[PDB]
A paper describes a structure:
To understand the structural basis of PPARγ - TZD interaction, we crystallized the lobeglitazone- and pioglitazone-bound PPARγ ligand-binding domains (PPARγ LBDs) and determined the structures of the complexes at 1.7 and 1.8 Å resolutions, respectively. The final model of PPARγ-lobeglitazone consists of two monomers of the PPARγ LBD (referred as A and B chains), two molecules of lobeglitazone, and 454 water molecules. The A-chain corresponds to the canonical active conformation of the PPARγ LBD with H12 in an active position, and the B-chain has an inactive conformation with H12 protruding away from the molecule. Lobeglitazone occupies two sub-pockets (the AF-2 and Ω-pockets) of the Y-shaped ligand-binding pocket. Lobeglitazone, with its molecular volume of 577 Å3, occupies 44% of the ligand-binding cavity, which is 10% more than the space occupied by pioglitazone (34%). The unique p-methoxyphenoxy group of lobeglitazone is positioned in the Ω pocket, making tight hydrophobic interactions with the residues of the pocket walls. The contacting surface area of the p-methoxyphenoxy group is 90 Å2, contributing 22% of the contact area of lobeglitazone to the binding pocket. The two nitrogen atoms of pyrimidine ring of lobeglitazone make hydrogen bonds with the two water molecules nearby. The lobeglitazone bound to the B chain displays slightly weak electron densities and higher B-factors than the ligand in chain A, owing to the lack of hydrogen bonding to H12. The binding of lobeglitazone to chain B, which displays an inactive conformation of H12, suggests that the extensive hydrophobic interactions significantly contribute to the high affinity of lobeglitazone to PPARγ.
Author numbering:
A (entry chain B): 202 to 239, 245 to 268, 275 to 475
B (entry chain A): 207 to 263, 273 to 476
The structure:
């Protein structure tokens, strides 16, 4: 109605999402970048990985090093799913969707969000682990045997390009909401209300980027192009997950643990 | 802190609806005839059990076949309960060995709690509500399966008299999972801290949802005596079954759960 009210409503939505993102994700990009730019224990080879087991208490140990790193990543992704699920509840409209559509949106959205937020913890030379208490080098991850040596490298390649956009946590809170509210996920029952919510989130993202990054020509479009790129990264990751359970022998052992990590 | 506890209650109820397709509300609707679906098929003897083959969507002997049908239900329930447990705030952040231990020693307490939702004094819903198997038929089975469901029916009658609904049960089942006394837990204190918060939320939920029900919180917590007794008696029955039966193929999930330590 009144002049400026549309801008104000979009800024209020942006602020709400940022405040919720702070409540849901303790290690924000701001906190991560401070750590990366200078202290965490550095894991830079297999010997320092064994020494790192002492300095930090990792929760996933019950094998060969490449397998154990992978299972440590899977433990952390399960924790991330619970944080992202909590965040999703604060996106206006989400909890009023059909319950099956909520589950579907999270099922098919969490991996894109995981790799988006992992970029916040990465620089060109490695990644923060254990809530910022450790740092594992990119070179060490690349040195793992096939097929684990190329598990993290496409994530680093994405992150260096993505981080060059210099998004902050207020930008990312809205970007992550836009990814969750994707009306093209397989099996959704009511697509229209999801696209309606996403329309409002896209309006909020566009205004946030125009105000926060006025010098960054067409940043909104560039960020949508990245959303397209994350789809590719996730499809590649799922391919490797199918390699690790066929090619890499270790299958029907510990059925309860298999259950926690089914999907 | 009251708002946090209500938010926790709401979160657990939502996760419970997402994890368990056959809720108590849906089961009660079926048992009382509310639904717009054909009434469940009633199995009350051998002949009707046989017809249940064709009315409802390996072992040829009756007792074993009933027993194996219970085992496959538990396998399904374990999958649903594990999905629910991961939603309990703090659970997936525990040491992974302790996550496994909590599921190993908690799933059957939850299975029998939720079995009561599908029971009345005369029988129990089976196959997603498609069938109803009578308590008297289950009592008739040959030894060692004589009265093997009777402790479950006795518990359910008393438990259902508490009048809990799904929103109450969601918090109760979380309290069960987060039990710091399970054998072999490595880090008891983080589990007790979560259970403390769940108990606070359960107390508030019961006072708000059942304001007229005196000491319902205490009476619900006392039902763990009944539940642990059911589990110990069932483990003992399994030991008898090992002696009285020939080859007993067991699902890998149940063999892990029943593996001693
Ligand atoms: C000393 O004990 C230790 C043992 C191991 C160890 O390695 C690590 C590495 C690590 N990261 C590299 C940081 C997290 O990266 C991730 C990579 C991939 C995913 C996607 C997961 S994976 C899958 O299959 N499906 C998924 O969705 C998620 C996160 N995080 C934690 N531990 C360190 C210490
Ligand atoms: C039409 O063909 C049919 C074939 C079989 C048939 O019998 C039944 C009976 C039944 N209940 C009696 C209802 C479920 O009670 C249960 C009792 C015990 C358990 C625990 C299992 S047992 C074990 O040792 N460890 C376990 O964790 C689980 C559930 N549920 C499903 N099928 C009916 C029809």
């Amino acid at each position: 109605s009144a002049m400026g009210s549309e801008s104000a409503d979009l800024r209020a939505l942006a602020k709400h999402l940022y405040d919720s993102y702070i409540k849901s994700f303790p290690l924000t990009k701001a906190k991560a970048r401070a750590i990366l730019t200078g202290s965490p224990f550095v894991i830079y080879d297999m010997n320092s990985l064994m020494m790192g087991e002492d300095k930090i208490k990792f929760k996933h140990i019950t094998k060969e090093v490449a397998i154990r790193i992978f299972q440590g990543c899977q433990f952390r992704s399960v924790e991330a799913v619970q944080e992202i699920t909590e965040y999703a509840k604060s996106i206006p409209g989400f909890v009023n969707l059909d319950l099956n559509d909520q589950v579907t949106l999270l099922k098919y959205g969490v991996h894109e969000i995981i790799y988006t937020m992992l970029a916040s913890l990465m620089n060109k030379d490695g990644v923060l682990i254990s809530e910022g208490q450790g740092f594992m080098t990119r070179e060490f991850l690349k040195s793992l045997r096939k097929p684990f040596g190329d598990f993290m490298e496409p994530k680093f390649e994405f992150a260096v390009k993505f981080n060059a956009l210099e998004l902050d946590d207020s930008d990312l809170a809205i970007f992550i909401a836009v990814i969750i509210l994707s009306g093209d996920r397989p099996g959704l029952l009511n697509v229209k209300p999801i696209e309606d919510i996403q329309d409002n989130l896209l309006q909020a993202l566009e205004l946030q980027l125009k105000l926060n990054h006025p010098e960054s020509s067409q940043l909104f479009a560039k960020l949508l192009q990245k959303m397209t790129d994350l789809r590719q990264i996730v499809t590649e990751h799922v391919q490797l997950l199918q390699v690790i359970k066929k090619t890499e022998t270790d299958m029907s052992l510990h059925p309860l643990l298999q259950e926690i990590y089914k999907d």
